[PDB]
Amino acid sequence: FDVLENAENPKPKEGVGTWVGKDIKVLTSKFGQADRVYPFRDGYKNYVFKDKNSYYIVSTKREEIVSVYATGEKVNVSPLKIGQHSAEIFNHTSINPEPSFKVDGKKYEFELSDEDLKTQTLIKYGDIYAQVYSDQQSKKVLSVRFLTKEMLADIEPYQLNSNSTSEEHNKRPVEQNPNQLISLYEVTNEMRKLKGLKPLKINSDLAHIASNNLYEATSEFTEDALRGQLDKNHVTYKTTAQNVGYAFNDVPTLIHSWMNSDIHRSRLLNSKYDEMGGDVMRDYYSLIFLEK
CATH class of the missing domain: 3.40.33.10 (CAP)
Known part of the structure; x- marks a missing residue:
């Protein structure tokens, strides 16, 4: 991915x-x-x-x-x-x-x-x-x-521009990562609602897999690691995919980058998917999609 x-x-x-x-x-x-x-x-x-x-x-x-x-x-x-x-x-x-x-x-x-x-x-x-x-x-x-x-x-x-300098940032509060994940789910479903699609239901097993996949990746996001983790966790599904983002500061910017990438956009607006689960930790955003 x-x-x-x-x-x-x-x-x-x-x-x-x-x-x-x-x-x-x-x-x-x-x-x-x-x-x-x-x-x-x-x-x-x-x-x-x-x-x-x-x-x-x-x-x-x-x-x-x-x-x-x-x-x-x-x-x-x-x-x-x-x-x-x-x-x-x-x-x-x-x-x-x-x-x-x-x-x-x-x-x-x-x-x-x-x-x-x-x-x-x-x-x-x-x-x-x-x-x-x-x-x-x-x-x-x-x-x-x-x-x-x-x-x-x-x-x-x-x-x-080269003349400008990026701002320095203090520690993220404990509330930030879990609330960015909730905003990621909500903004994904708002984008789906604008195109007349059904919102995706949040699946805690996909969120667990996303968190482990993200933790293991930063210690690349292969499709074998995703399909292997779904089978290992006895999750039943027809199809699956994953959207990932690095160094993003906010959900609207992240969603804009996925919406302007045909492969990531097609996953967000896929009519066949009915569930999702993700993780947000520091600079990374991960969202797994699933068709039961």
Whole structure:
């Protein structure tokens, strides 16, 4: 299995883009209590809000919203829209190929590749940014992440120019890895729901195999080790496959890389699979799929 590696637009007037900079209590009042709240490295906290028609990963720092990943059938990501043609964004929107900014006086300049401009477009809206995720096949908007320049420097989702330096990071809290795995499952199922596919059920035996396979691999991901571990664990199945990612900092970036790789995309959006199980530890992400 191939291991994948890591003159302006006004501010939004409505939708999730207006949440950036507000206190997290504004969403708790609107939606009620979050489904999940957990810390991650460098002093951020994630709040997950979800229902049948919407999915939000809201990041905060000192209770201020600094980022919102949004997707689903009924989310307001104005001026964008989930399901719109991605080519329609560029007709009336200022896009810079080498976006540049300062975070606490330190300059950050990104070198956006061909794939990044078409399927991970970085757009400046007022004083904030938006990452617009598009499908390489359908060319439609899948999800949008509105975020501040300091979150963007921390995530570093694009290659930095030689003049820039990557940020240093503190220890991951104990809550991070298990919550990134839950977000990996949830975002995988949100992508499947946009294409009218059934969500995959979480299988604890596949998650165990994924964790051992990942631990054994970092002490390559062969198909004989996967099919051998399934037979060794007496798991019954018709077909199986695995998606892997290295050095990723967040689930939206990881999913974008799998969605823009035909082989990984075909596994995520496979109509025949009905179960999945994975693991997240440090820089690695692994997700095993199964057709019972």
